[model samples]
Target chain A: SPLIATSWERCNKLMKRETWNVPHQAQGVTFASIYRRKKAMLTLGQAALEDAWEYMAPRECALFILDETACILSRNGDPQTLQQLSALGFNDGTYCAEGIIGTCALSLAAISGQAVKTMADQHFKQVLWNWAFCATPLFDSKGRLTGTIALACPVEQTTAADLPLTLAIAREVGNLLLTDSLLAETNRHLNQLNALLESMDDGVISWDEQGNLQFINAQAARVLRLDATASQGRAITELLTLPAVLQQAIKQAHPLKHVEATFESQHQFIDAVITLKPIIETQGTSFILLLHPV
Target chain B: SPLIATSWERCNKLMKRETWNVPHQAQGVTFASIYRRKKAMLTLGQAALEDAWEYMAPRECALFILDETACILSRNGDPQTLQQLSALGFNDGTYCAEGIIGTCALSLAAISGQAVKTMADQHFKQVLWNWAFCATPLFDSKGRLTGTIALACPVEQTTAADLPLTLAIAREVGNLLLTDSLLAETNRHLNQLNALLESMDDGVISWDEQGNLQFINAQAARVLRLDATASQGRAITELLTLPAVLQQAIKQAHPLKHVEATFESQHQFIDAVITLKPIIETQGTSFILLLHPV
Candidate 1:
C-alpha cells in the first residue's frame, strides 16, 4: 500500500535514525485543565459514545474521541479493551498523532479527512503490532476539523464494519457540536434583542400567546407601577387591574395606536398614551405595549 | 521507541489489508467556498506566513498551513518546492492526512500537539519518502485544535532547525486567531453598551477630553436641536452655544447635578433640567450630559 510505504519511509527516517526512536513523550496539563479545555466535547462526546457502544458492546475494543491534535479528549468501550490500552499508557490527554506515535488509524483518518483502518503489523512499532484500529474524522458545522472518533482492537479481531461505525459516531458528535453552537448563538441574539428594547425609557412589554408576561424591561416595570426585572412569566394582570377599555382591546387582539389610556383608577402615575400591537407568528399571537406616561 | 514500535506494528498489517494501495482521494468545496470559510485565517495567515517565509527565505522547502483535517489551507515557500507539490496535487483544499498520503510531519504534529519532523524513509508512502517535513500544531486561545503549520524539503536537505521554525510560525498564527477573537468581542461589548444608553427617552451626550463631541443619542440630538446619530466627532460648540453659567461650569470640569438650564434662548423646545458629570481616565477627562426636557 502506498500509504504504508510512505508511513514506513517516514518512520524509518524518524529512527534518528535511532536514539529519539520513539515519538517524543511530553507531559500534559493537569487533569482539571484538560477537563476545562474539553468541556463541550466531553459533554457531547459522552452521549454519542454511549449510543455507539450499544452496537459494539462487549467487543474487546476501546473507543476514543481525540482533539485535533490527537490528544485523547474522551473515551468509552469494553472494560477489557479500556484496561488493555490503559496498561500501555493510553489515556485521556495522551498525544496520539502520527508525529508523536508514528502511523496509526486516527492519524490517517484525520490527515485524510475520511474514515480509515490500519490492521495489525501495519503499525510502525512493535507494541502496536498486536492491535488494529479504525477511525473517522470529526468536523464542526463550518467544516473545521474538531477531532476524531476511533476504535482500537486486537489486530486478529479487526472488523470490516468498524470504520463505518466510527464514521457514524463521529458524524453524530459533530452534529451535537453544531447544535450546541447554534443554541448558544440563538441565546446571544435573544439577549441582545432584549437589551435593545430595554434601552428605551418608553415602556416596552410583551405577553406570550397564553397571556403570560414574557418580558417587562426596567422602564416597563415602572410603567406598571411595580419594581420589575423578575416579574417575568406572571400573568400580565397579576401586576395591576387593566382598564375596562384596555381589557376589551387586548382581548380582541386589536392594534391600538397612540390611544389615551388610564391605569389611574385614581393615580396620576398610570395615565398615558399607549400603543397596543399584536404580533402573529406560527406559534400564535402575542402582544406588545409601548406606554408614554402623560 | 514504543511509539515507533507501535507505529510499525500498525503499518505491517495495513499491507495485508492491501489494495487500498493508496489513501482515498475525496473532492472538496469550491475555491469560492474555501475562500469564504477561511476568510479570517487567510488575512492573518498571509501576513504571518510572509513574515515566516522571510526567515526561511530561499530554503529548498515549502511552508503550509493545514486545517485540522490535514487539508492544506495556505502555502508559501521556494518556487521549486511549490511547483513540485503543486504537480503532486498538494494545494489548498487538498487533504494530506496520514489516512490519505500516509505518515507525515503534519499528521504527527497535529496528533501530538507539538512540533515534529519526519525524515526520509520515515514517510509511510513512496511519494513522500523522498521528502522530509516538519510541523507544529496551531491552537485557538481556548486551546482547541485549529490546525497546523508545516514545512517540507527534500529528505537529503532536511535541516535540524525546521521543527522550531514551524513551531514559531504556528504560534504566531494561533496568536492572530486569538487577537481576532478578542477584537470582535470588544467591539460587540461596545455596541451593546451604546444600545443600552441609547434606550433612554432623556437626552444623553458626551464630549471627550478634547471637547470634541463623542456621542449624542437621538433624544440628545433633539435636546441640542441638531439631528444626531452621525453628529459625532464635531466640537460640542459646533452644535449649540453654551449658556454663560454652563460655560463657566464646563470650563472648570466641575460636576453639576440637576441644574435648571435653558437652551431655550427662545424656543421652549430646548428648556431642560441638566446634569454635567466629569469622568477622569488615565488618558484625560471627559464629560457626560444628561438633559431632562422640562
Candidate 2:
C-alpha cells in the first residue's frame, strides 16, 4: 500500500510540473537503443520467460519486462491477457513506470525497488481497475536495479501468493545472468593461467585434498610417463612414489620451496629443484607440487 | 527392492562359503587400521554430518556415516536413536555392510552405489527391522564412491519421499566438501597469478567485451596515471581514447604480437611495442593488452 501511495505522489508531481502523457504510439529507435543497452538481459530474459510460461500461462496471467527507464522491452502471455494489454499500449517501447503507468504495481515496484502487488480497485487509473498486477524489481550483477518484471491477470484470479513466486522468478533470472558473467570471468583466468603454465619449462602437478591428481602441465605429465587425459582422476599414489622428504613434508603440513630432490620410479627418474606447498584448508589439505630440472 | 535383495544374497554367500566371521569384537589395532585407511573420508564426512544435522535432527531421524569398507566413521541423532545404535556397536570401527550387518540399508547403498530405503520387514536383520532406513552413497570430487550416509527413523514414521531428500542431503554434503578443496586450489592459482603479475616488468591492462576495464597491473596503473583501486569497474573509454589501430585490431578479433603503437593521454604518453590478444569465448570477447615501453 505504501509503495502505491509513494508512486502516486510522484505521478501527480510529474503530471503537474512535467509534460507527462502516454505516447500515441511506440518509438522503434527508443526501443532499439534500450534493447542494445540491455542485450544480455534481453537474451536471458526471453529464455526464462519461455521456460516459465508452461506453468504461468496456465494461471491466466501475462509477463512483461520493462527496462530501467520503464520502457517495455518484452512480453509474453496467453492470447486473452495479451489482447487485453495490447489495447492499453502494453507492447514493447510502451512506457509503464510511475508517471507513465499512473501508479500501478509495475511503477510501484520500480520506484520502491521491491516486489509490489495491487488489486483491482487499488489502481490509480480507472483503465487498470479491471486487472490485478504484481511486479518485482530486477537487479544486475552489481546489485543495481535495472528493470521490473510484472505479472498481470484478471482481478478475480489474483492471489497474494503470486507476489513471492514472481519475486523468486525475477531473482532467479538475475542470478542466471550473474552466473553467465562469472563463468566468463573464470574462463578468462583459466586461459591466462594455461598460457603462463605452458610458457614455463618446469613441470607442475597439483592434487586435490584427497590426493587425487587434478592438474598436470604438459612437461610434468611427459616426464612422469603419463598423459593429462589418462592421469586425471587417478590417485597420485598410483602413479609415482613421492620422495621421502617431500612425503614427510606434506604429511606434516610443512611448506617446502625450491628444495632439491631426486624422485625416481621404475621407468622414470628426475633430479629437480622442487617446491611442495601444502594448502591447509578448513575441509582438508591440498598440495601444489612444482618441479624444475636441476 | 533389488538393492535389498541383492545385498541379502551377498551376505548369505559370504557367510555360507567364505571364512568370514565377526572378529572377536573390534580391537584397538583393527580400528586403527580402518581409521588410517579412511582418514580422508572421516575428516570430510564429519563436517558434512554436522552441517546436515541442522536440517535432519528435527525430522526425528539419526544420521550415520560409513566409510568405503562399511566401517562406521561418525554419527549424529536424537538420544533414543543414538542409544539404539550404540547398543548395536554402531560406532568407531564397527562394520555394518553386507556380510557384517546383513541386508541393512547402509550396506545396500554402499554396495549398490545408489540411494536405498528400507521399511519394517524389508531389513534382513531383526535388530534393524524396528528402524526405517534411508541411505545414500557419497562420492569424492573424482566421482569415486567414498562412503554412505544413512538416516534412521522408527518404522512407522518412514516415507518413500524421504529417500530423495536423503539423497539430496548426501549430494549437498559431498559438494560442500568438494568446494572446500576447490577453493584451496583456486586460491593457490590466484596467489601464483598475483605473484606472476607483480613480477612482470611490462604494463598490462585487460578489458572485457563491453570495454569495461577488468584487470590493471601495477605498472599499467602507474603509467596511466591512475590508481588501480579507483580505476577498477570503470570503462576504458572514460579515461582515454585508444589508438585507431588498436581499436581496429580488437574489432577484427586479431592478435597483434609486438606491434609498435603510440598512446597519449592528458598526464602521460608512451611509444611502446604493444600486443593485443583477444580471447573469444562463447559469451563474448575479452582483450589482454600488453605493453612494453619502446
Candidate 3:
C-alpha cells in the first residue's frame, strides 16, 4: 500500500492558500487564479534561492511577509548562524526554532515573501545564521505578497547568479506564478482525458506522468501479467514484456497523445495502447494503457 | 537476369528520318529514355482499365501501336478476333498476337516521337476491324508520334479516362520519360550518399522507402546482429529488435533532424548504431542512420 503522507496534505493545503488557484473545489471554495500566482511566486523564489546556492557559493538571503501564520521556508549554509539570528526575536512570534521549523532552506523562504539578508553576525538565536544566508519573499498575481526565500553561507562566501539573491528570487517567483497557471490548465485537460479513457471499450491502463502505473482496466490486468490492485504504482515496462515488431511500430508511428503497439506474447497476440498524453509533459504523473486482444 | 530493351535504333544511314533527340553516339548506341513515357502510359492505362472493367461484364479491351518494325498492344479480352478482323494475313512478325517485332508499343512510341492511331479498317485489313479494335499511337516528349494503344470490346465501351486512351497513352509516355530521368538522378544521388557513408567513421545504413534494408556498413553489421553480406536483403526490424523509446524518438525527432539518444547506450540503453533517419515522411522511403561503436 502506498503510504498517504501527512506531509502531502500539509503541502497541498499550504499550496491552496487564498493566493493560489485551486484545481478542485475545497470546502465549496474555489481558489482564484490570483491566489495560485501568489503561492507559485513564493514557491519559485524559495526554489530558485536553493538552486543558486547549491550551484554557487552562498551568502545571506531571506524573505519576509507581514503576516506570520504562513511559515514554510527553505535555507542553506551555517546551521549555527541560523539559530543565533532567529534567537534575537525579531518582531512577533516567539523563538520556536529548530524543531517546528525544521532547519531547511525551503522552510525559511516559506515564512516571509520579502527578500532579506541574514549573516553570521546577525544569526537567529546567536547561533542559527552564523554561516551566511539569503532569501526572498514572493507575491501573488494580483500583486499581493505570497512567499519568501532564505539562504545562508560562510562569512567569506558570495556567489553569482544570485549575487543579488533577492533579485533572482523575485524573478524566479514570477516565473513560478506563470507556471502555476499552466499547471492548473493541464490538470483540467487531464481530467477530461481520464473520463474519456474510462468510457472506452478497450481495456485501458496507464502509468503516472512519470510513467508510473496510473490505472488499468480488467482486460489489461490479465494480458499484462499484472494484478490490478498490486500493480498500481509499478512501471509499465516492469509488467509487460513487449514484442519487438510492435515496439518498432510504436516507435515509428509516434502519436504524441496516443500510440498503438501490437505485440504477441508466447501465448497470444494483443494490440496495446500507450500514450504520453498528460495535461503537461513534466508532471504527467501516470501512464495509461489500453489493452485489446487480437 | 534483367533484360535491357530499346525502342529507337534506326540505322545511321536513315538517321535524318528520326526526329526525336539523337543518340549520344552512332551505331548500336543504347537509348534509355525512349520507352519511359510509353511505359508510364501503359501503367496508368492498365490501372484505369482495371477500374473500368471491374464492374463491366467480362469483355476484351486491347490497344495496338504500329511502328516500322513491330506492334505493341494491351488487351482485356480476345486476341483471335483482332487477327480474324484484319484480312491482311496476320504475319508472325506482329507482336502481342504472334511475332516479336523489333519494336513494340514503347519502341514505336520512342521511334516516331509522334502520336498516331492505327485502325483495322484503314491501316489493317478490313477483317481485323470487324471485332471492334480501338488503337491510338503514342508519342515521344517532342510531340512526335511513336507507338499506339488499342482498347477492344465486343460491346460498345467508352469512359473519359479511357476515351482519351490515345491521349492518355501519349501523356503516360511523357510521364515515363520523366520517370526515367528521375530514376537516373536518384541513382546518382545514391552513389554520392554511398561515398559519404563509406568515408564516415560512424557506421552507416539505409532503408528503402518500404523499410527494406538497402545498405549496411561493416560497423553497423556487427552492432545490429547483421551479417555483412546478408543484411542488405532483410527488413530493418528483423535485424535488431528495437526498443519502443528509441522508436518513438526516431519518428518524432527525424525529418526535423535532431541528434539525440547520444552515442552512449547507457542513456538510451540500446545496442546498435543510430537508426531510422528518414528523408521523406509521406513516401517513407529513404533515410540514413549513423551508428556508434561501429
Candidate 4:
C-alpha cells in the first residue's frame, strides 16, 4: 500500500531532482563474458521470458529482465512497445535502479525485495510518468533475491493478473537453473575423480556390489588388456578371466592381502600379488582390487 | 654414520622395551580408496622404483617405497629377498615408523628427515638384526618430504652406492607426479569452462587476437547451424557472412552497442543486434560479439 511513496522518498534521498541518473559507460564488461558468468539466470530466463512474453505479446506489452543491481539483462516484446520504450532512453545494459531510473516497478521491486506494480505518475521520473510496469523478484534455489523480471506497456495501469503470472515464471526459471547447475557440478566432480584414478601408477579396479565393473584405471586397463571406457558397467567376469582360486575367494567375499595369483590377461598368464578390500557404503558393499605385478 | 644410533635412541623414547608396535588393523580404508588418495606418489613411484630396482637386481637387493610416516607403500626385490622380507611381515601397507618397526632405514629416514644406512646391531628390532637398508626421502615439487624410497637386503651392510641411487629416483618420481597433476588440472578447468558455455541459452561467440573464433556456446552453435567442435579455430568471417557494417566495425576495432546487423548462416539471412567489445589482454587484444536476435 505504501510502496510508491516510500520508493519516491528513497529515490529523492539517492539523487537530486535536476539530475538524471544515466547508466555509466558500462566500464567495458563484454556481453559475452558477463553472459558466461551469469549464464545460470541469463540462459534459463531467456527461455522463461521468451515463452511468457508470447501471451504478453497479444496484450501489446514489453518485458525486461534485470539483475539485482537493476541492470537490464535484455528487453523484448511487441515491436511498437520496444521502440516506444527505446525512445525514452531505456536499452539493454542500462541500470534502472531507483537512483537511476526512479520509483519504477523494477527499482521498487529490487530495493524492497518484493513483487510490485507502478503505473503512470507513480514513477519519480517525468520521462516514465506515462509508462506502467509490473516487476517480480527472481530468487535462486537458496531463496535469495538475485534479480527481477518485469512487464511494461503504455497503458494507464497494469492488470492485477500479470503479477502472479510473472511470479510463477520467475520461480520456474530459478528452479531449473538449480537443477541444471547441480547436474553440471555433479558431472564435473565425476570427471575429476576419474582423471585422478586414470593417472595412478598401480593397476586399480573396483566392482559394485552387484559384481559389475565400476571403474578401471588406465594402468589396470592396459595391464588387463581391456578398454577402460568400454569395460565399465560390464560384469567383472565378462571383462577378466580370473583364476578359479581368486574367483572363489571373491565369491566368498573374502578380503585378500598380497595373495599370489596368476591372472589370465590378454590370453596369457601374468603373475601378481592381488589385494582386495571391501568398501562398505550406504547402499551396498563394493570391492577394490590393486595389482602388484611380478 | 651416527644416523642409526640416534634413530634407535628416538625409538627407545617413542615406545617401551617389550611392546611391538604392530600397525593397527588398518582402520578399514580400502586399498582402492587409499590408492586413489595417494595416487600421485603411488603411481609415479611404481615407475620410478621399478626402473631403479632393475640396476639394484644383481646386487641381490630389495627396494621399498615408504611414505613420510614410514608406512611401506610397496616393496619388491630379488625374489628370495622379497620372501625373506615378506617372512618378516614387511608387506605393502605396512607401517615402518620408529614406534612401530623400530630403528631401521625407513623409520630412521622418516623421523630424522634424512637418508641413512643401518645394518645388523643398528636395527632396534632383533628380527631385523640380519638386515641392512639405505633409505632416502622423497620430496614433492614444493620440496616437502612427502615420502621415502629405500633399499634393503641381507647384506652385512648397505653398499655406499645404494644411497645415491634411491635419492635420484625419488626426485624423478616426484617431478613427474607434479607434471601429471598439473597437466590434468589445467585440462579439467578447460573442460569445466566449455561445459558452462555449452549450457548457456544465449548465443555467445568470441574471437582471439588473431581474429580466429575461439568459442561458440551451444545456443550459438544451434542458431548458426554450425558444429561447436568443428567451427572453433576457424576465422570469424570464414564461418559466418557478416553484413558490411558489422565487418567494418570489427576491423576498425570499434565497439558497437545494440546495432542492427544481419548475418548469413546456413545460407539464410538472420537479423540480430550485434554488440562488439574489445578485450585488452596482456599479450594482445581479443574481441567478443554477443548476438541478441531480433
**DockQ score for model 2, please?**
0.05
Please write out the lDDT profile of model 4 over residues B103-132, one tens digit for every residue.
777777766666666788677877777788
Candidate 1: list runs displaced more than 4 Å: A1-294, B1-5, B16-35, B195-202, B208-212, B218-240, B248-287, B290-294
Give the Cα-based TM-score of candidate 3 against the true structure: 0.27
Lowest lDDT block of 10, candidate 2 chain B: B16-25
lDDT of each: 0.68, 0.68, 0.41, 0.67
Model 2 per-residue lDDT tens digits across residues A1-294: 666666667766665422335543457886677778888777766655664554233566788878777777888867788887888778777878565667677777867777777877677676777888877788877888887777788888764335544554465456556655655666567666555544344577777678887667788877766766788768887777778888898789787867887777555676778877766667787776777655
- Which residue ranges in model 2 land beyond 4 Å of their true spot? A1-6, A9-39, A42-48, A179-183, A186-201, A221-229, A241-245, A248-266, B1-294
Please give the range of 10 consecutive residues that has the lowest summed lDDT in model 1 chain B.
B16-25
User: TM-score for each prediction?
Assistant: 0.49, 0.50, 0.27, 0.46
True contacts kept of 3: 0.00
Interface RMSD of 2: 9.4
True contacts kept of each: 0.00, 0.01, 0.00, 0.00
Better of 1 and 2 by TM-score: 2
For model 4, how many clashes? Answer: 1
* Model 4 segments more than 4 A misplaced: A12-36, A54-57, A139-145, A176-192, A264-271, A280-284, B1-294
